[PDB]
Ligand binder design. Structure first.
Ligand SMILES: C[C@@H]1O[C@@H](O[C@@H]2[C@@H](O[C@H]3O[C@H](CO)[C@H](O)[C@H](O)[C@H]3O)[C@@H](O)[C@@H](CO)O[C@@H]2O)[C@@H](O)[C@H](O)[C@@H]1O
Ligand SMILES: C[C@@H]1O[C@@H](O[C@@H]2[C@@H](O[C@H]3O[C@H](CO)[C@H](O)[C@H](O)[C@H]3O)[C@@H](O)[C@@H](CO)O[C@@H]2O)[C@@H](O)[C@H](O)[C@@H]1O
Ligand SMILES: C[C@@H]1O[C@@H](O[C@@H]2[C@@H](O[C@H]3O[C@H](CO)[C@H](O)[C@H](O)[C@H]3O)[C@@H](O)[C@@H](CO)O[C@H]2O)[C@@H](O)[C@H](O)[C@@H]1O
Ligand SMILES: C[C@@H]1O[C@@H](O[C@@H]2[C@@H](O[C@H]3O[C@H](CO)[C@H](O)[C@H](O)[C@H]3O)[C@@H](O)[C@@H](CO)O[C@H]2O)[C@@H](O)[C@H](O)[C@@H]1O
Ligand SMILES: C[C@@H]1O[C@@H](O[C@@H]2[C@@H](O[C@H]3O[C@H](CO)[C@H](O)[C@H](O)[C@H]3O)[C@@H](O)[C@@H](CO)O[C@H]2O)[C@@H](O)[C@H](O)[C@@H]1O
Ligand SMILES: C[C@@H]1O[C@@H](O[C@@H]2[C@@H](O[C@H]3O[C@H](CO)[C@H](O)[C@H](O)[C@H]3O)[C@@H](O)[C@@H](CO)O[C@H]2O)[C@@H](O)[C@H](O)[C@@H]1O
Ligand code: CA
Ligand code: CA
Ligand code: CA
Ligand code: CA
Ligand code: CA
Ligand code: CA
Ligand code: CA
Ligand code: CA
Lengths: 292, 292
């Protein structure tokens, strides 16, 4: 089954993503096809999939920005029925907001079926225009129709995935202990991670013995990303990925505190120096503790 | 010997503290006797004692607020010589700024002798008035004269002392690991710890699943205290005490993240709930990790 997490949902036929129009929280805001920029946060185009207990392959889909849910208007099975953002909750019993999401016949893209109507999410006429209508539409699980096929591009990691990325890194100390703080994390492109740093007041901060040294920079960066996450998104049930690490050098005579993020492919960690905004594959320290 | 740390230096005869007048960083700012309020941060009256390597019982005394040093004017041995704040460094060879500090004949208070002049820090005429002159003055190590006797009231803890306070607490999990970040810490009265919290934006922050939950509040509070430390004091070589803890309940089925501070007597820790500003001797969790 599709895993719990945050997805950028991209049509299989044309490069249009599922977009809540203007990110609006109003009930009935149309959900439309819209172009996107890879390796950015696409602000109106991120969807938190929450599995429904006891209902196989079925999910609510919550817009990360608005906190409102993908909703089939009045649950109508009529072809052309509006698909809109609407107030709801993560584990609602409202079938208008419940979606069975399973692999299409190509085995890579998914089809998205309303649980009540049994109709499918359809980019009408495969229109690649910004603001193209998305509707519930008659269809089948096995047909090739690209109007109803959707790539679920995973934008989050589970804590287990983050832990695996750390574990395969070559700069981990033998004494390493990791402390996990949340369960599912939006992975930032470096462009956004950098922006948060740039706006944090840290670029302007002076290194000062004990009173504002390694530990203070690293903790301040983590706090900055935490604040950004809450200020930026209205959905709940996920965190923003930003780790803190304490490390020791090879000679075992010097220590450092710093941050880390994740690669685009989610497979590896990358170290971040909060004193200068630099990204490094080797920061010159082996991590003996991390929290994230 | 007197230990490295931060001291509130109180005359033995009258309740006047050593005060850098108006906290001014100007060279030549008079150091004077001034009244004080116990259980507050006395902003102009905190002194960081740095031991000089291989000069027994001898220290620089740096005002925490100004970053400037206690300085005997032109190193004169004349009775009545000005004692002022003056620019310097922690390990200076300038004898005007070097002070031999040893127990008086009462075995509890200290005398403070200029390393160059061999004269003593003297509250002139035992004057208890605010702004009373402090001067270098003839004297002896053994005499009873209270004008030249000073209680060194310790306002900081070493990391070892902090570690000991944690270790004697009854709410520590069997699996506990602690991660020490600095070496010497100003202990805040709860009044000041609370003030930092009140101004941090946390009192007005909503708990939100993963995106702004326990860990976010605890880390935000630590970052707030770190920012406050650097913004508040010009001296270097110390940090402000504020810990983060992760804990698990007795039933082992729920976890929490929170902060901790120290008691006035420095012997014990006290838990702090960043979601509501409360202080607790028992927060209902046993700590399995701490950083501070
Ligand atoms: C170009 C066109 O593609 C297919 O039709 C789609 C529609 O397909 C869906 O609805 C039809 C009934 O209208 C039928 O139930 C089909 O099984 C289902 O996938 C639909 O995607 C609309 C709106 O976007 O566009 C096209 O009309 C195909 O069935 C047609 O024969 C034709 O090849
Ligand atoms: C009341 C007074 O107390 C003592 O005198 C102090 C001064 O004491 C210091 O300086 C004197 C010389 O002036 C001498 O060297 C002494 O050993 C030394 O402690 C000094 O503290 C001043 C300034 O505050 O005040 C008093 O004059 C004592 O020696 C006097 O006989 C007399 O009892
Ligand atoms: C928040 C807002 O985001 C951008 O505008 C969105 C727009 O974003 C997508 O489309 C644009 C071009 O229109 C780019 O491809 C972006 O990479 C996409 O993410 C859509 O979401 C529409 C419809 O909901 O709303 C706009 O606000 C950006 O252009 C703005 O400057 C701004 O940052
Ligand atoms: C059949 C109908 O179901 C519910 O109403 C839906 C509505 O549901 C959501 O929004 C309303 C406010 O409009 C409430 O907050 C619900 O809790 C939400 O789940 C939407 O799905 C719209 C648009 O498709 O359709 C309505 O039917 C329920 O509130 C009604 O009482 C009634 O049972
Ligand atoms: C920063 C400033 O601190 C206080 O004023 C200081 C003053 O502080 C001490 O004396 C006052 C009475 O004048 C109280 O006893 C305090 O508890 C002491 O710490 C002195 O340091 C003088 C001389 O340098 O400077 C003043 O600025 C306080 O009264 C102010 O409101 C303010 O917070
Ligand atoms: C003997 C004298 O010693 C030094 O001057 C001191 C002076 O020293 C501090 O302040 C000056 C600037 O005035 C420099 O930053 C020094 O590095 C500091 O240590 C003060 O102690 C004053 C007041 O007592 O006395 C002067 O004698 C040195 O700078 C001189 O060149 C000269 O060697
Ligand atoms: Ca395409
Ligand atoms: Ca958490
Ligand atoms: Ca800052
Ligand atoms: Ca520090
Ligand atoms: Ca007294
Ligand atoms: Ca440090
Ligand atoms: Ca805040
Ligand atoms: Ca969190």
């Amino acid at each position: 089954s599709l895993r719990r997490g945050i997805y950028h949902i991209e049509n299989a036929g044309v490069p249009s993503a599922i977009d809540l129009k203007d990110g609006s929280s109003s009930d009935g805001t149309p959900i439309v096809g819209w172009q996107f920029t890879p390796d950015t946060i696409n602000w109106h185009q991120l969807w938190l999939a929450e599995p429904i207990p006891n209902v196989a392959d079925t999910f609510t889909l919550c817009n990360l920005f608005s906190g409102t849910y993908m909703d089939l208007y009045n649950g109508s099975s009529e072809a052309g029925t509006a698909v809109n953002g609407w107030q709801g909750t993560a584990f609602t019993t409202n079938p208008h907001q419940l979606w069975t999401i399973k692999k299409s016949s190509d085995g890579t893209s998914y089809k998205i079926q309303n649980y009540g109507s049994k109709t499918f999410v359809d980019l009408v006429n495969g229109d690649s225009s910004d603001g193209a209508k998305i509707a519930g539409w008659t269809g089948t699980w096995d047909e090739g129709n690209p109007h109803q096929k959707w790539y679920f591009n995973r934008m989050s990691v589970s804590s287990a995935e983050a832990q695996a990325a750390i574990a395969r890194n070559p700069h981990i100390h033998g004494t390493y202990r990791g402390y996990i703080l949340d369960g599912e994390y939006l992975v930032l492109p470096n462009a956004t991670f950098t922006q948060i740093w740039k706006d944090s007041g840290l670029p302007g901060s002076k290194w000062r013995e004990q009173i504002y040294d390694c530990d203070d920079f690293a903790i301040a960066m983590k706090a900055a990303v935490g604040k950004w996450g809450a200020d930026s998104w209205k959905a709940n049930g996920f965190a923003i990925f930003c780790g803190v690490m304490l490390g020791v050098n090879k000679a075992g005579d010097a220590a450092h505190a710093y941050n880390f993020t994740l690669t685009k492919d989610h497979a590896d960690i990358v170290f971040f120096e909060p004193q200068n905004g630099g990204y490094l594959n080797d920061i010159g320290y082996d991590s003996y503790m991390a929290f994230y």
